[PDB]
Amino acid sequence: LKNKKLSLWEAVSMAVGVMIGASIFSIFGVGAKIAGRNLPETFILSGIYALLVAYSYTKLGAKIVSNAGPIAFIHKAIGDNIITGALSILLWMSYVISIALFAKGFAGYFLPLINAPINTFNIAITEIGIVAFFTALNFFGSKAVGRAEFFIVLVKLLILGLFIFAGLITIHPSYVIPDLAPSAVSGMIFASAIFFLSYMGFGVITNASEHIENPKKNVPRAIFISILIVMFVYVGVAISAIGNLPIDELIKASENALAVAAKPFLGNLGFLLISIGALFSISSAMNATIYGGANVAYSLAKDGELPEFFERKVWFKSTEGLYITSALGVLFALLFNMEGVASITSAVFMVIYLFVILSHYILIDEVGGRKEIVIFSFIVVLGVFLLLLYYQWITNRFVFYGIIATFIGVLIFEIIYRKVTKRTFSNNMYVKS
Ligand SMILES: CCCCCCCCCC
Ligand SMILES: CCCCCCCCCC
């Protein structure tokens, strides 16, 4: 008896697909708004943060194998307690808010495509509709869409290959050169904090590590390769879009930026292709996030453990979790705007990453690595976290309290859940590895 395993390239594709769905087709507009022409440099900077985090994930994942992902690293370092417990809930939440992000991104490209007006109602309906669709998919087609994921990722990479290389032919180099004004530089740095989520490949990979062939080798390789691929794609797309459309026209077309940005150099067929590619990209990212991420993370948080053998591409256990995940996802999507959801997601990922970096530090004699680099990584991510919170405090204080309420709500829930259920975590998550 054995799990259906992913090869290296399938694992790479999975992370690349999720990352592109979020960065290219969901939050790209927000980046044009905050970073403007410095957006290409924002992606690079966010990629540096991602690589610093990757240093820890790759060292830990070469030694520890578990579908519990970061929660296995954390348990191995600090044992079982309310922190470990709350982090398992937080990892689930990170998938929940990502679902809101994808739903929003889908609505943004979908409504202009069908000529529907942008309303608070039309947006709301389309988000509810797309989430409900992926919820229902559990019962009829989540595995089949799963088999289509690899081919959707290839196609959107080609489409974005076209966008990059055709776009570069006609770019104005005069709007490609980085703006070094103090306010252009500081917008670039604030955006980088929001755009940390652009490299959210860690989740789907490590939550699938036992379903990955030769995981001690291929989990670290998939994390590193996928980050490098998307770094090149993002920079190519930001330059091409920015060099072809007035920066203030990117911002008005925020919800579907790249389809409007394709028009100058690919005409109405480019608008159509980018829009259709966006819908498939986001769709495939949502399937990977729900069936592969959220299903795993919910069961681990609820049970304190996972089955040794299960189908990743369905809601394999505790079906109530599927409805809870979808309902909370729709809630976040209705309450906040794209920049809001992006900020909350990025904040949550940073807290997970900090505890992984800490775990790497505690377990350094066992897993290896340089203590200097690990401390450096921790300080960077913490700094970026606080920059994000500061930015929210001055820009949108509702988002600020939203972020704080999430962390606090998660910790309080853990204490109450642990007391009600007696649920505990053990080294049986990773002991066999
Ligand atoms: C608004 C409901 C959308 C219906 C699902 C369509 C599948 C997405 C593929 C483009
Ligand atoms: C993430 C914590 C999940 C708690 C829900 C348990 C409900 C049990 C349904 C029978």
mmCIF file with all atom_site columns, C-alpha atoms in Angstrom, residues 22 26-35 97 100-101 104-105 127 187 190-191 193-195 197 251 254-255 332-333 335-347 387-400 403:
data_model
loop_
_atom_site.group_PDB
_atom_site.id
_atom_site.type_symbol
_atom_site.label_atom_id
_atom_site.label_alt_id
_atom_site.label_comp_id
_atom_site.label_asym_id
_atom_site.label_entity_id
_atom_site.label_seq_id
_atom_site.pdbx_PDB_ins_code
_atom_site.Cartn_x
_atom_site.Cartn_y
_atom_site.Cartn_z
_atom_site.occupancy
_atom_site.B_iso_or_equiv
_atom_site.pdbx_formal_charge
_atom_site.auth_seq_id
_atom_site.auth_comp_id
_atom_site.auth_asym_id
_atom_site.auth_atom_id
_atom_site.pdbx_PDB_model_num
ATOM 1  C CA . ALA A 1 22  ? -1.495  34.815 -6.273  1.00 0.00 ? 22  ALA A CA 1
ATOM 2  C CA . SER A 1 26  ? -4.399  38.369 -7.851  1.00 0.00 ? 26  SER A CA 1
ATOM 3  C CA . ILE A 1 27  ? -2.176  41.035 -6.236  1.00 0.00 ? 27  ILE A CA 1
ATOM 4  C CA . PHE A 1 28  ? -0.282  42.500 -9.217  1.00 0.00 ? 28  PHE A CA 1
ATOM 5  C CA . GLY A 1 29  ? -2.558  45.588 -9.228  1.00 0.00 ? 29  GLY A CA 1
ATOM 6  C CA . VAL A 1 30  ? -1.895  46.370 -5.556  1.00 0.00 ? 30  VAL A CA 1
ATOM 7  C CA . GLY A 1 31  ? 1.833   46.321 -6.415  1.00 0.00 ? 31  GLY A CA 1
ATOM 8  C CA . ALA A 1 32  ? 1.389   48.751 -9.296  1.00 0.00 ? 32  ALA A CA 1
ATOM 9  C CA . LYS A 1 33  ? -0.458  51.012 -6.817  1.00 0.00 ? 33  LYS A CA 1
ATOM 10 C CA . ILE A 1 34  ? 2.144   50.904 -3.995  1.00 0.00 ? 34  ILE A CA 1
ATOM 11 C CA . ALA A 1 35  ? 5.445   50.364 -5.859  1.00 0.00 ? 35  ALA A CA 1
ATOM 12 C CA . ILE A 1 97  ? -7.246  33.622 3.636   1.00 0.00 ? 97  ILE A CA 1
ATOM 13 C CA . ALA A 1 100 ? -10.284 34.604 -0.257  1.00 0.00 ? 100 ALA A CA 1
ATOM 14 C CA . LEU A 1 101 ? -7.364  36.094 -2.220  1.00 0.00 ? 101 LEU A CA 1
ATOM 15 C CA . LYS A 1 104 ? -11.145 38.012 -5.311  1.00 0.00 ? 104 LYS A CA 1
ATOM 16 C CA . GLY A 1 105 ? -8.537  37.671 -8.051  1.00 0.00 ? 105 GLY A CA 1
ATOM 17 C CA . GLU A 1 127 ? -16.464 35.273 -5.036  1.00 0.00 ? 127 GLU A CA 1
ATOM 18 C CA . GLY A 1 187 ? 6.809   52.389 -1.728  1.00 0.00 ? 187 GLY A CA 1
ATOM 19 C CA . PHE A 1 190 ? 6.377   48.588 1.727   1.00 0.00 ? 190 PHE A CA 1
ATOM 20 C CA . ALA A 1 191 ? 5.065   46.673 -1.297  1.00 0.00 ? 191 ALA A CA 1
ATOM 21 C CA . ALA A 1 193 ? 6.243   43.374 2.705   1.00 0.00 ? 193 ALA A CA 1
ATOM 22 C CA . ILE A 1 194 ? 2.796   42.797 1.147   1.00 0.00 ? 194 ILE A CA 1
ATOM 23 C CA . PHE A 1 195 ? 4.373   40.842 -1.709  1.00 0.00 ? 195 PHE A CA 1
ATOM 24 C CA . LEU A 1 197 ? 3.073   36.004 -0.150  1.00 0.00 ? 197 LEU A CA 1
ATOM 25 C CA . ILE A 1 251 ? -3.771  51.243 -11.280 1.00 0.00 ? 251 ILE A CA 1
ATOM 26 C CA . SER A 1 254 ? -6.133  46.996 -10.829 1.00 0.00 ? 254 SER A CA 1
ATOM 27 C CA . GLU A 1 255 ? -8.472  43.976 -10.696 1.00 0.00 ? 255 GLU A CA 1
ATOM 28 C CA . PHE A 1 332 ? -12.454 37.451 4.544   1.00 0.00 ? 332 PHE A CA 1
ATOM 29 C CA . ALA A 1 333 ? -13.211 38.164 0.862   1.00 0.00 ? 333 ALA A CA 1
ATOM 30 C CA . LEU A 1 335 ? -14.809 42.122 4.550   1.00 0.00 ? 335 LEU A CA 1
ATOM 31 C CA . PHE A 1 336 ? -11.530 43.254 2.981   1.00 0.00 ? 336 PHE A CA 1
ATOM 32 C CA . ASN A 1 337 ? -10.234 44.460 -0.391  1.00 0.00 ? 337 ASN A CA 1
ATOM 33 C CA . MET A 1 338 ? -7.359  42.888 -2.348  1.00 0.00 ? 338 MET A CA 1
ATOM 34 C CA . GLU A 1 339 ? -4.680  44.934 -0.546  1.00 0.00 ? 339 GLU A CA 1
ATOM 35 C CA . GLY A 1 340 ? -6.394  44.005 2.739   1.00 0.00 ? 340 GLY A CA 1
ATOM 36 C CA . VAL A 1 341 ? -6.509  40.245 2.054   1.00 0.00 ? 341 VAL A CA 1
ATOM 37 C CA . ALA A 1 342 ? -2.949  40.371 0.643   1.00 0.00 ? 342 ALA A CA 1
ATOM 38 C CA . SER A 1 343 ? -1.723  42.068 3.826   1.00 0.00 ? 343 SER A CA 1
ATOM 39 C CA . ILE A 1 344 ? -3.416  39.648 6.233   1.00 0.00 ? 344 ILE A CA 1
ATOM 40 C CA . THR A 1 345 ? -2.102  36.641 4.235   1.00 0.00 ? 345 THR A CA 1
ATOM 41 C CA . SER A 1 346 ? 1.445   38.036 4.147   1.00 0.00 ? 346 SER A CA 1
ATOM 42 C CA . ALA A 1 347 ? 1.324   38.753 7.894   1.00 0.00 ? 347 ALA A CA 1
ATOM 43 C CA . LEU A 1 387 ? 6.965   47.233 8.517   1.00 0.00 ? 387 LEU A CA 1
ATOM 44 C CA . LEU A 1 388 ? 3.789   45.543 7.247   1.00 0.00 ? 388 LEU A CA 1
ATOM 45 C CA . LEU A 1 389 ? 1.969   46.235 10.544  1.00 0.00 ? 389 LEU A CA 1
ATOM 46 C CA . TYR A 1 390 ? 3.215   49.838 10.611  1.00 0.00 ? 390 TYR A CA 1
ATOM 47 C CA . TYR A 1 391 ? 2.053   50.324 7.004   1.00 0.00 ? 391 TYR A CA 1
ATOM 48 C CA . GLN A 1 392 ? -1.404  49.019 7.965   1.00 0.00 ? 392 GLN A CA 1
ATOM 49 C CA . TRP A 1 393 ? -1.515  51.254 11.053  1.00 0.00 ? 393 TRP A CA 1
ATOM 50 C CA . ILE A 1 394 ? -1.051  54.401 8.923   1.00 0.00 ? 394 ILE A CA 1
ATOM 51 C CA . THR A 1 395 ? -2.902  53.278 5.739   1.00 0.00 ? 395 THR A CA 1
ATOM 52 C CA . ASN A 1 396 ? -5.903  51.100 6.725   1.00 0.00 ? 396 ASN A CA 1
ATOM 53 C CA . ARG A 1 397 ? -6.409  50.526 10.443  1.00 0.00 ? 397 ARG A CA 1
ATOM 54 C CA . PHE A 1 398 ? -9.305  48.106 9.893   1.00 0.00 ? 398 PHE A CA 1
ATOM 55 C CA . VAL A 1 399 ? -6.799  45.763 8.212   1.00 0.00 ? 399 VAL A CA 1
ATOM 56 C CA . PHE A 1 400 ? -4.388  46.375 11.120  1.00 0.00 ? 400 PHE A CA 1
ATOM 57 C CA . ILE A 1 403 ? -4.377  41.083 11.422  1.00 0.00 ? 403 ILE A CA 1
#
